[PDB]
Design an enzyme around this catalytic site. Structure first.
Site, PDB file in Angstrom:
ATOM      1  CB  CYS B  46      -1.096  -0.170   1.212  1.00 19.87           C
ATOM      2  SG  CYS B  46      -1.260  -1.622   1.923  1.00 19.87           S
ATOM      3  CE  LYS B  49      -1.660   1.244  -4.150  1.00 24.77           C
ATOM      4  NZ  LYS B  49      -2.236  -0.214  -4.639  1.00 24.77           N
TER       5      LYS B  49
END
Ligand SMILES: Cc1cc2nc3c(=O)[nH]c(=O)nc-3n(C[C@H](O)[C@H](O)[C@H](O)COP(=O)(O)OP(=O)(O)OC[C@H]3O[C@@H](n4cnc5c(N)ncnc54)[C@H](O)[C@@H]3O)c2cc1C
Ligand SMILES: Cc1cc2nc3c(=O)[nH]c(=O)nc-3n(C[C@H](O)[C@H](O)[C@H](O)COP(=O)(O)OP(=O)(O)OC[C@H]3O[C@@H](n4cnc5c(N)ncnc54)[C@H](O)[C@@H]3O)c2cc1C
Ligand SMILES: N[C@@H](CCC(=O)N[C@H]1CSSC[C@H](NC(=O)CC[C@H](N)C(=O)O)C(=O)NCC(=O)NCCCNCCCCNC(=O)CNC1=O)C(=O)O
Ligand SMILES: N[C@@H](CCC(=O)N[C@H]1CSSC[C@H](NC(=O)CC[C@H](N)C(=O)O)C(=O)NCC(=O)NCCCNCCCCNC(=O)CNC1=O)C(=O)O
Lengths: 461, 461
Positions: B46, B49
């Site tokens: 998460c 990215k």
């Protein structure tokens, strides 16, 4: 006199929606439009503002370019390029609207309406009379402007309209007002380059918004380059040879008043208010009552005191927004033409987003309103304050603040207030939940979306 | 053997939340972490990215600069600058996590756990034994990679991890996969400059997403510069002197297979799947059952077949997301330590956002799932397709599509699927409403926020 089923005065947000809804239910309506269709929102409101705001957001992010591994861009912004584009968009929207009307069999009486002496309600548009068992006044409002009487030199400044007619970014801007329009005009101008000053009557802006917002917003403004002039007032405006010279008065309570000159001002923008568009209607011919400011008085069903006459939108003075105007005219048509005795708009839990930087979004009651309604004992509020992860690599910084106002033991979520990146698109859903009657439990029983700023609302504690 | 109340194997999303919740309820827990705390999400999921995505979004908007009245910027993007920053952020997050643990009195057994032969469940971390009346396996998963056996030269490519270790933007990238990771890796790389090819097994991507999404997304990819290689497969990979040479096979049904060479490839990224992190646990010592792929089998309450052992997150194979892992470990602690016999996570109406460009957000059932559950007769779907007004002045264009899936006569909103600008922050609220049981009426009885993309969801027709 030509008779229709519906005669809507004003082709803006509420006007058009009510006429569209009516024609779709079988009625025969005719929008009486005195200028350009689309009203204030399309021509000098929502639409032009957002375009200019998108642009402002663009200069902003240009600042975090290098921080994101790209080379910098100096940034000589060209006002006219985006101006001409913005204006084009507006033309396209007009055409589209005209079409939709005619497409829906809606007669457009092109001119200025005013009620006649006639017993039964009737209006005269360019020497011609029209009437109908249902007339809807949806003439909206307009910019409030000071008197030479009050403020000598008031007429030297412009308003939001004048703003949308500017073909050049003024070098020195001074904005007077503390509401969403004043806040947005201040944000667009200074983000786009102008040396802006926001002249407010008190210590903060959006004073009628939840304390946290009123506070945060005065701060992000300052932090961004907007000069907030508190407890200040424009005494008189004068046209010098180098621009304008504004005589202001700063009465910071506890101190002695001080007079100040802001010289070389290029743009003086009045963002003090919207006055109703009602005197040229000849309301007095029928005795349609109004308030002391000219707003038209209506019941929960938008009923004036006269039978067969209603009012919706800005003209009534309540909840000055396009969606509220629309939503009221839509429910009215059903009431009238679909015989639904109770379609009336609910004025509670109305969502609103202020396009400042970062954007504000808010629905429901403020903490104080919750308090005054439930009592200190029955109002729990959750808050959070974080840095969007967009700023995890930027030197520039803005923050995000969220506050949830809960009522009673179930903790019914009665108010949501936030400001930050993405708060513009973020509100609508929680507004739906807030409208359905959501409690904190419901929010906490929703799996979150990581990583996002919106996830912070469903994990408050 | 040291005894605690809770012994959590794995310090990632689900692991930590379950231990935090437990310690806050009075228990004594110890997270056994074999590498870096924060798990896959913080270190290689998460967090990294999103940083890279924010960056990709930045090169994008750089293209609309001139269109918004600014001069253009050539754009020599420097990979390492944002890489080093991204990695720093990750360090800061680690420190923050370590602290929180100790702050909450959570012992961190630093090493690799494996169950012992011992009768009562027990684990041995570095020659030392620990046990507890409650052990939670939350070891997650890892990248699936092809065999030299199957695909000769498979090990020549990298995965999402290898991606997060790259110190230079590969000139020629080739990504193999059709899911959210593959879609995002394709979007970041090509937005950032790399000549990307997305190699898919069929005609579209995100095939398990509502048809409209699967379709729209394959299109916006192509429209943006990503070369979608359909019905293609990597036969063998070879290291040439000029990069890699990928032998692919395109079997477009109805045509004859064709062999193709993609030469000079700098980066070959495998985005085919996540295999569970379970063999080194010595699960077989206790007979904790698993499926044929190693996923750990649990009941609705995350119960393995053994008493005192549970499983949560990626390791179980269901709903591979950080919030689902978290939400499950949080409900488990309550179950166990707060004696709430029924706290179990509800796996329906889980929201998910795919950070492609524009972003996808989706919650609830797809049309087909609605159909197969209610029957064609009882499933109404509303759709819309528009151009965000951000593109009202840009030559570049992306669109926004929204589809609402309704069930039965009340039109219970069982699924929301959209893709477009702002869809990332937009989902969470409607997810809450969708979770509360909202019907179309409820959505239509919510005043809209104009102008926004989210307003289109509450005015569908
Ligand atoms: C700057 C600025 C920014 C704004 N931003 C937003 C935003 O982002 N979103 C949303 O919040 N709202 C916004 N608003 C508010 C929104 O514009 C209004 O609340 C909405 O336009 C009001 O709808 P209405 O139908 O009452 O009026 P209006 O749209 O104002 O329309 C009245 C129409 O009737 C015509 N008319 C008047 N008298 C007569 C007559 N006698 N005969 C014939 N025709 C007549 C008018 O010329 C006009 O065309 C903004 C306003 C301003 C000013
Ligand atoms: C690229 C990429 C992008 C993603 N993006 C997103 C996103 O944007 N949002 C959200 O969607 N989810 C995202 N995910 C998914 C999310 O990362 C996972 O679903 C989540 O991390 C899983 O939680 P978990 O607790 O099961 O596992 P994990 O966080 O994977 O953690 C397991 C931890 O336990 C440790 N461990 C393993 N075995 C042992 C052992 N025997 N003893 C001791 N310690 C051990 C591991 O080293 C690790 O530290 C992404 C994944 C990848 C890969
Ligand atoms: N949501 C906004 C705000 C920033 C944000 O999301 N920050 C996260 C990103 S770290 S990426 C890791 C991910 N974090 C999240 O999912 C954050 C969301 C929520 N606050 C939560 O409770 O988890 C996770 O796996 N959590 C499981 C767990 O063990 N969680 C234990 C409880 C949370 N820690 C306490 C709150 C402050 C810690 N912040 C911190 O530690 C610093 N930052 C965070 O926790 C955004 O996306 O920009
Ligand atoms: N919401 C997205 C999508 C774009 C958008 O909002 N477009 C609006 C901006 S025009 S700004 C004017 C404003 N529009 C809105 O509030 C649009 C929201 C919704 N679709 C609606 O029903 O009104 C209004 O005052 N409406 C009152 C009314 O009479 N409305 C009559 C019914 C709507 N027209 C039919 C739909 C296609 C017409 N589009 C069009 O005419 C072209 N564009 C629009 O209607 C965004 O903000 O970017």
């Amino acid at each position: 006199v030509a008779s229709y089923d519906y005669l809507v005065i004003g082709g803006g947000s509420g006007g058009l929606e009510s006429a569209w809804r009516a024609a779709e239910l079988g009625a025969r309506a005719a929008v009486v439009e005195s200028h350009k269709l689309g009203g204030t929102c399309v021509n000098v409101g929502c639409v032009p503002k957002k375009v200019m705001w998108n642009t402002a957001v663009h200069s902003e992010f240009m600042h975090d370019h290098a921080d994101y591994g790209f080379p910098s861009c100096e940034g000589k912004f060209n006002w006219r390029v985006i101006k001409e584009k913005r204006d084009a968009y507006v033309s396209r929207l007009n055409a589209i609207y005209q079409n939709n009307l005619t497409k829906s069999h809606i007669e457009i009486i092109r001119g200025h309406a005013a009620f006649t002496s006639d017993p039964k309600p009737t209006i005269e548009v360019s020497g011609k009379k029209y009437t109908a068992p249902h007339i809807l006044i949806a003439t909206g409002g307009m910019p409030s402007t000071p008197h030479e009487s009050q403020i000598p030199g008031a007429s030297l400044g412009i308003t939001s309209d004048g703003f949308f007619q500017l073909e050049e970014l003024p070098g020195r801007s001074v904005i007077v007002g503390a509401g969403y329009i004043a806040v947005e005009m201040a944000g667009i101008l200074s983000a786009l380059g102008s040396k802006t000053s926001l002249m407010i009557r008190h210590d903060k802006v959006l004073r009628s918004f939840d304390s946290m917002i009123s506070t945060n917003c005065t701060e992000e403004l300052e932090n961004a380059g907007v000069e907030v002039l508190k407890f200040s007032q424009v005494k008189e405006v004068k046209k010098t040879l180098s621009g304008l010279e504004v005589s202001m008065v700063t009465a910071v309570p506890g101190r002695l008043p001080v007079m100040t000159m802001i010289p070389d001002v290029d743009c003086l923008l009045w963002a003090i208010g919207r006055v109703p568009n009602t005197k040229d209607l000849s309301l007095n011919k029928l005795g349609i009552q109004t308030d002391d400011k000219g707003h038209i008085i209506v019941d929960e069903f938008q009923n004036t005191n006269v039978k067969g006459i209603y009012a919706v939108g800005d003209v009534c003075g309540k909840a000055l927004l396009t969606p509220v105007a629309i939503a009221a005219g839509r429910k009215l048509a059903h009431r009238l033409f679909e015989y639904k005795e109770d379609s009336k708009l609910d004025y509670n839990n109305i969502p609103t987003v202020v396009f400042s930087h970062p954007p504000i979004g808010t629905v429901g009651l403020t903490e104080d309103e919750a308090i005054h309604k439930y009592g200190i004992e029955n109002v729990k509020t959750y808050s959070t304050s974080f840095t969007p992860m967009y700023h995890a690599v930027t030197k520039r910084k803005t923050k995000c603040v969220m506050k949830m106002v809960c009522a009673n033991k179930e903790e019914k979520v009665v108010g949501i207030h936030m400001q930050g990146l993405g708060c513009d698109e973020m509100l609508q859903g929680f507004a739906v939940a807030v409208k359905m009657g959501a409690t904190k439990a419901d929010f906490d029983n929703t799996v979150a979306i990581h990583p996002t700023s919106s996830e912070e609302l469903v994990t408050l504690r």
